[PDB]
């Protein structure tokens, strides 16, 4: 019901990196949220039956080249549930003369890979009374200037209680979640009729994926459950805004694909979830595209925002 | 407990097709993948592919497509290679295994199955 | 693909000394890498998986290491239930395909 929740940027050096560990204790459990742009932006998710576990750092293995164990949650035998969320690959169509609705939405561009990006220091941007912080970034290599005046942010805020945002699209959260924002925010597409979409890859249980299960857009809700509750969740509504005011009429689908095993090895390299979990070989990979090939667009102002919550335990009841 | 339990070695002719089995028991056979290894006498390993039961979704190196066929029935709890168009060069022992929880590695193998490809 | 390059393709040693194999490849695979032993007559055994991981029950004289394109195996003293054929296979892109093989022979 309700959680105490302690954030710290944890830095190190060489090669310091963003790393934010959110902590957030109930009576008699923990839930961590371990976020970081080393690599492509990446969750570690872990629930513990105490209110004493701890997240332990090496900051040297984890930047090297076999950086399994770098990070823990300790004590391991108090370790409920444990997966990863990963934003791989920032995706882009060409949409003219595609239906909406379509997959692939339109012919695809090359991907930005989200692991060639560089990124500001969250440390400015972590609000302690807000429980949030944000990852801004821009590819490394870009000799078109695409991000010349623009950035992708991960903007994530953690909740010590139950409420509902006023802000659209207004997700009931519980203490058992963070909230995810992405924001594009004036890159140039790379021609006209683009919609823009993201690659999210889950650690998945098993050889086999979950499917996504599902009044306009803005009231529609759809969940992602890791596995029977309680357990990991992803909860968003099928809706992006194509203004930062979110003005109803900027709303934009969100159609999600199929949700596909996949190999790490047709993914860009995670340090982060390899520190973790080891080498891995069972994700879950899902397409999110934003937008339809005609109406309000990323093309009107190139402004786009998704928000998701994600979580452990009981999902919302969102109702 | 872990055990893979092959089908009997097997004499076949040219040009028909066979097909091999692989029991799984001593753990719930949906949670890992199965994947099948070539043997020719006298020689190394190669990898054909991989199934996961639930789904029966698949891998296969393509110098094995369209020679080898994964099936499995869940229910059985059994694996299937399905072999056609057979000749001289699939005269080996075929292995059954079973991936490790992370699906890095193999660690639970059939003893395998020999096929000899004759007149 | 990966190619990878298993080396040497037979060795010969004593019983007591400490023997290398290497599998070198041709991309990073990230320590997505096994070692197999297999005996005459029989299914290959894992070994050693993710580079570094030793199988329960496998004796501790038999060790895995590297990162990156080298992998490394090692059998500090050799006993002579070693004789036999070894095999690095990778879990990067597919196809997984296996080292060319060493065969390890013993002195006496």
């Known amino acids: 019901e309700t959680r105490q929740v302690s954030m710290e940027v944890i830095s190190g050096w060489p090669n310091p990196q963003n790393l934010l560990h959110i902590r957030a204790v109930g009576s008699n459990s923990t839930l961590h949220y371990v976020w970081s742009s080393l690599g492509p932006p990446a969750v570690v998710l872990v629930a513990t039956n105490t209110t004493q576990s701890v997240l332990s750092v090496n900051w040297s293995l984890l930047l090297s080249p076999d950086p399994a164990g770098a990070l823990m949650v300790l004590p391991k035998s108090s370790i409920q549930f444990s997966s990863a969320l990963v934003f791989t690959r920032l995706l882009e169509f060409d949409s003219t003369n595609a239906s909406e609705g379509a997959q692939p939405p339109g012919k695809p561009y090359p991907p930005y890979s989200l692991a060639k990006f560089s990124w500001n220091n969250i440390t400015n941007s972590l609000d302690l009374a807000n429980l949030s912080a944000d990852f801004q970034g821009r590819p490394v290599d870009d000799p078109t200037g695409a991000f010349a005046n623009g950035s992708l942010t991960f903007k994530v805020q953690a909740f010590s209680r139950s409420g509902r945002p006023a802000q659209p699209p207004r997700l009931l959260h519980t203490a058992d979640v963070c909230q995810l924002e992405v924001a594009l925010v004036g890159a140039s597409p790379r021609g006209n009729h683009s919609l823009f979409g993201l690659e999210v890859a889950t650690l998945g249980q098993g050889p086999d994926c979950p499917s996504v299960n599902e009044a306009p857009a803005v009231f529609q809700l759809n969940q992602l459950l890791w596995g029977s509750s309680p357990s990991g969740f992803m909860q968003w509504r099928p809706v992006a805004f194509s203004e930062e005011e979110r003005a109803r009429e900027s709303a934009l689908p969100c159609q999600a694909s199929t949700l596909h095993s996949t190999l790490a090895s047709s993914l860009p390299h995670s340090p982060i979830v390899q520190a973790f979990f080891g080498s891995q070989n069972n994700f879950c990979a899902f397409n999110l595209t934003f937008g339809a090939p005609t109406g309000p667009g990323y093309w009107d102002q190139y402004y786009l925002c998704w928000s998701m919550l994600l979580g452990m335990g009981f999902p919302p009841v969102d109702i | 407990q872990v055990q893979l339990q092959q089908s009997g070695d097997d004499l076949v002719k040219p040009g028909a097709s066979v097909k091999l089995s692989c029991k799984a028991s001593?753990?719930?056979?949906?949670?890992?993948?199965i994947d099948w290894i070539k043997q020719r006498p006298g020689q190394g390993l190669e990898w054909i592919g991989r199934?996961?039961?639930?789904?029966?979704?698949?891998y296969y190196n393509e110098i094995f497509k369209g020679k080898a066929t994964l099936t499995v029935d869940i229910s059985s709890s059994t694996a299937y290679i399905q072999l056609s168009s057979l000749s001289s060069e699939d005269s080996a022992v075929y292995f059954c295994?079973?991936?490790?929880?992370?699906?890095?590695?193999?660690?639970?193998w059939g003893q395998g199955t020999s096929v000899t490809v004759s007149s | 693909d990966i190619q990878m390059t298993q080396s040497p393709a037979s060795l010969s040693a004593s019983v007591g000394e400490t023997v290398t194999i290497t599998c070198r490849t041709s991309?990073?695979?990230?320590?997505?890498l096994a070692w197999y032993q297999q005996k005459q007559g029989k299914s290959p055994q894992l070994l050693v998986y993710?580079?570094?991981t030793l199988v329960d029950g496998v004796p501790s004289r038999f060790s895995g290491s590297g990162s990156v394109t080298q992998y490394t195996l090692k059998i500090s003293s050799l006993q002579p239930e070693d004789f036999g054929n070894y095999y690095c296979?990778?879990?990067?892109?597919?196809?997984?395909?296996f080292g060319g093989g060493t065969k390890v022979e013993i002195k006496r």
């Open positions: 993710n580079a570094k």
């Open positions: 991309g990073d695979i990230h320590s997505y």
């Open positions: 296979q990778h879990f990067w892109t597919p196809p997984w395909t």
């Open positions: 199934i996961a039961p639930g789904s029966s979704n698949t």
């Open positions: 001593g753990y719930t056979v949906t949670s890992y993948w």
């Open positions: 295994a079973r991936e490790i929880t992370s699906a890095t590695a193999m660690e639970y």
